[PDB]
Amino acid sequence: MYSFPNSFRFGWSQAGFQSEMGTPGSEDPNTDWYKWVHDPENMAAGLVSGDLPENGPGYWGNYKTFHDNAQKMGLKIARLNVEWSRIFPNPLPRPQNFDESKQDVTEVEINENELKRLDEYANKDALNHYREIFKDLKSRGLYFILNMYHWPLPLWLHDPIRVRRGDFTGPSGWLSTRTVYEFARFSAYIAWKFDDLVDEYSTMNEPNVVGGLGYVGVKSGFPPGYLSFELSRRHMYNIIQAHARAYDGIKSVSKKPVGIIYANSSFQPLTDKDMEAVEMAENDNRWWFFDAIIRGEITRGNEKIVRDDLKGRLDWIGVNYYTRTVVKRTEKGYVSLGGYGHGCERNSVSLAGLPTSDFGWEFFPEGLYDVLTKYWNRYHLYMYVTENGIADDADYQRPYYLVSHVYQVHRAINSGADVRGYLHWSLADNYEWASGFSMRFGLLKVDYNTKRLYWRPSALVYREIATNGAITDEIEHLNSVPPVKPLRH
Numbered sequence: 001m002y003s004f005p006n007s008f009r010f011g012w013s014q015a016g017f018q019s020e021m022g023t024p025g026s027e028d029p030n031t032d033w034y035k036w037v038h039d040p041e042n043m044a045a046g047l048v049s050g051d052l053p054e055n056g057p058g059y060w061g062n063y064k065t066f067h068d069n070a071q072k073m074g075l076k077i078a079r080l081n082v083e084w085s086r087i088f089p090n091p092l093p094r095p096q097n098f099d100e101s102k103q104d105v106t107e108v109e110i111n112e113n114e115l116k117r118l119d120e121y122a123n124k125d126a127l128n129h130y131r132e133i134f135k136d137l138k139s140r141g142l143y144f145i146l147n148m149y150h151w152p153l154p155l156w157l158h159d160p161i162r163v164r165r166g167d168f169t170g171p172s173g174w175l176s177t178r179t180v181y182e183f184a185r186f187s188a189y190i191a192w193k194f195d196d197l198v199d200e201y202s203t204m205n206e207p208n209v210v211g212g213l214g215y216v217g218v219k220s221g222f223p224p225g226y227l228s229f230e231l232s233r234r235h236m237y238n239i240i241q242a243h244a245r246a247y248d249g250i251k252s253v254s255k256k257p258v259g260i261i262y263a264n265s266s267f268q269p270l271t272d273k274d275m276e277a278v279e280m281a282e283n284d285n286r287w288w289f290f291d292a293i294i295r296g297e298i299t300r301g302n303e304k305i306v307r308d309d310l311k312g313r314l315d316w317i318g319v320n321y322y323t324r325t326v327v328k329r330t331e332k333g334y335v336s337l338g339g340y341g342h343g344c345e346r347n348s349v350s351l352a353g354l355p356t357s358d359f360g361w362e363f364f365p366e367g368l369y370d371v372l373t374k375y376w377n378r379y380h381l382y383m384y385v386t387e388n389g390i391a392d393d394a395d396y397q398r399p400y401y402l403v404s405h406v407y408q409v410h411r412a413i414n415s416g417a418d419v420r421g422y423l424h425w426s427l428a429d430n431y432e433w434a435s436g437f438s439m440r441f442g443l444l445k446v447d448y449n450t451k452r453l454y455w456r457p458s459a460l461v462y463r464e465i466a467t468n469g470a471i472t473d474e475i476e477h478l479n480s481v482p483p484v485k486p487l488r489h
C-alpha cells in the first residue's frame with residue numbers, strides 16, 4: 001500500500017465559468033469568455049465549438065448534489081474560484097491619482113474606506129449565493145482553497161472581439177495596468193467578505209496559459225486571439241504585478257496563506273544530448289515567473305534587477321500537471337517535438353508508444369514527480385497538486401491515470417517534498433473552453449440534458465484512495481500504463 005500523511009487531503013478543483021451555469025438564473029453574460037464563445041465569426045472560423053456555457057452542469061443551482069457526491073467519495077479539500085464578473089458586473093469609475101501610461105504598479109492602497117466604497121458597486125445577490133455555496137462546502141468537512149481568477153474578466157475590463165480585430169482603444173484586459181489595479185482591489189474585497197470560510201487563497205489559475213494561448217497559440221481559440229509576441233510579454237509582466245498587488249491586498253485583510261496555481265509541463269530530453277535544452281525550457285516556462293514573485297528577480301529593458309514590491313509575494317505553489325513536453329537542442333536554442341506530450345493524435349499512441357487521451361495528451365505520470373521535486377529543490381515552498389486529470393468519457397484510462405499520478409505524489413513526499421494535497425480535475429464534466437462539452441474530465445459523468453451526475457468506475461477507485469488515505473493493496477495494479485493493444489492506434 002502507499003499511505004499518505006494523516007494531514008494530506010484528497011479532493012478536487014473546479015472553475016466557475018466551466019461548472020456554474022446550466023440551472024435557473026445562473027447565467028453570467030458579462031465576461032470576455034461569454035462574448036467570445038457566442039461570437040458569430042469565432043463560430044464560423046471554428047475557433048470555438050458553438051457549445052455554450054449556459055447549457056453547462058449547473059453547479060450554481062445543484063451545488064448540494066456536487067458536495068453530497070464529494071462527501072460520499074471521502075474528499076476532504078476543494079479548490080473553487082469566484083467569478084469577478086458576477087460580483088462587479090458594472091464599470092467602476094477610473095480612479096484619480098493613477099496614470100495608465102506608467103509600466104510599473106508597485107502599490108495599490110486598500111483600507112476599510114476603499115472596501116466600504118466597493119460595497120456600493122457589488123452584486124449582493126451573487127455574494128450571498130457564493131456564501132451559501134461555501135457554507136454548504138465547509139459543512140461537509142471540506143478544507144477550502146479559494147482562487148480569485150480562473151480566466152474570464154468582466155467585459156468592462158476586456159472586450160476581446162475589439163482586440164481580435166486589432167482595435168486597442170477599448171478595455172484591453174491584462175494588457176492594461178487598469179486591470180492590475182482593479183484585480184488587487186477585487187482580491188482584497190473577496191478576502192474581506194469571505195475570510196471566515198476560506199482556509200487558503202490563490203490569486204490566479206494558470207495565468208501563463210491565458211497569455212500564451214490568447215496572444216501566441218491563436219489556433220486554440222482563446223480570447224482575444226491576437227497574434228503578438230510583444231503583447232504576450234506585456235500580458236505576463238502585468239500578470240506578475242497583478243499577483244504581487246493581490247497578495248498585498250489579501251494580506252491587508254487576512255493572515256491566511258496566499259499562493260498561485262500555474263500550468264506545468266515536465267520537460268524531457270529527446271536524446272541524452274538535450275539536457276541543456278530541458279534547463280532552457282524550464283527557465284523560459286517556469287523559473288523566470290517564480291523567480292519574479294518569490295525572489296523579486298526580473299529582466300526589464302535587457303537588465304537583471306530585483307523589485308522589492310515583487311519579492312516574497314508567495315506562501316505556496318499550486319502544481320497543475322497533465323503531460324510532458326519533449327525538447328531538443330537547436331543551433332539557435334531548443335524546440336518542442338510533435339508526437340509527444342500535448343501534441344499527439346486523439347485516442348492513439350504517442351511516438352513513444354504511450355496511450356493518448358480524448359484530447360491527444362500523452363500518458364506520462366513520472367513528469368509529476370519531476371515537477372514537484374524540481375519546485376521543492378529550488379524554492380522549498382509547500383505545494384498542492386491543484387489540477388491533474390484526463391479527458392476520457394468512456395473511463396478506459398482514468399483509473400490508471402488517477403492511481404499512477406497519486407503514486408508519483410507519494411514518491412515526491414518520500415523524496416522529502418512538502419506536498420499537502422491532491423486535487424483531481426474534476427469532480428464532474430464541465431465546459432472545456434473553446435472545445436465545449438465533448439472533452440469530459442469528470443470522475444462523475446454529466447447528462448447535460450437533465451444535469452444528473454453518474455459515478456464512473458474511476459470515482460469508485462478515488463473513493464478507495466480518499467477514504468483510506470492511501471493507494472490500497474487491492475488497487476495497486478492500476479499504478480501502470482493503460483494497455484494499448486485493445487485501444488485505438
Ligand SMILES: *[C@H]1C(Br)=C(CO)[C@@H](O)[C@H](O)[C@H]1O
Nearest residue numbers: 015205206320322387425432
Ligand atoms: C486545467 C486543465 Br488540464 C483543463 C483541461 O484543459 C481546464 O479545463 C482547466 O480550466 C485548466 O485549469
